[PDB]
């Protein structure tokens with residue numbers, strides 16, 4: 169996260185850190201708890217991930233230093249990538265992880281609500297991006313989960329900012345015209361969380377952008393409200 173500040177423990181209890189153990193264990197991507205065995209994240213996280221056996225999901229984490237060999241994690245039973253996904257810049261950048269065991273909810277780990285059909289028309293004014301990603305293009309994964317408050321940008325404005333790309337309504341953009349606050353490397357898959365009527369909603373999934381926090385280059389997020397039917401199809405299968 170560029171231009172952000174340290175989160176307080178328990179502030180973003182749906183935020184997870186997904187680690188890969190291959191070739192060595194390291195943070196791979198962010199993700200969000202949406203159900204007791206479900207993490208929503210970005211499909212591009214799994215480029216070259218050949219098996220869910222190499223993944224570890226850590227919840228209730230503020231600092232990456234809390235993770236050692238003896239730290240409990242959730243194994244991944246299945247990786248479900250949207251089958252229209254080709255690459256982040258073309259959309260459908262969404263994936264579900266089905267956990268091997270159930271998350272016991274509490275003050276450190278609980279799900280974030282998905283947006284409702286009616287929420288497609290609401291204007292969110294309190295949106296935050298969180299993650300352990302870089303604070304600049306050439307940096308390292310941060311120990312403490314960072315947060316940044318960022319305004320949503322209309323589809324028309326985002327399209328003007330990305331000449332040569334097709335910004336669809338299945339994407340949602342966020343960022344200041346002058347830049348300065350944005351997601352960066354290591355933040356992808358994490359949430360863009362917006363508070364509406366005192367309830368946090370998972371509005372976006374951190375996906376891509378041209379550089380980090382540049383002027384007139386807002387971050388591009390998967391627009392979660394457009395995938396609620398897909399998420400229910402995969403998580404509520406008979």
Ligand SMILES: CCOC(=O)[C@H]1CCCC[C@H](NC(=O)/C=C/c2cc(Cl)ccc2-n2cnnn2)c2cc(ccn2)-c2ccc(NC(=O)OC)cc2N1
Nearest residue numbers: 194195196351352353354355356375376377379380387388
């Ligand atoms: C362990 C292997 O992990 C990996 O290969 C990647 C897998 C994911 C690939 C895409 C990902 N993109 C974003 O996170 C965000 C992009 C972005 C989003 C918005 Cl909305 C706006 C502007 C954006 N950017 C424009 N330029 N930068 N960001 C990314 C992540 C890393 C590097 C490059 N790109 C990366 C770096 C270090 C570690 N771990 C580590 O060092 O552990 C000790 C892990 C990873 N993950």
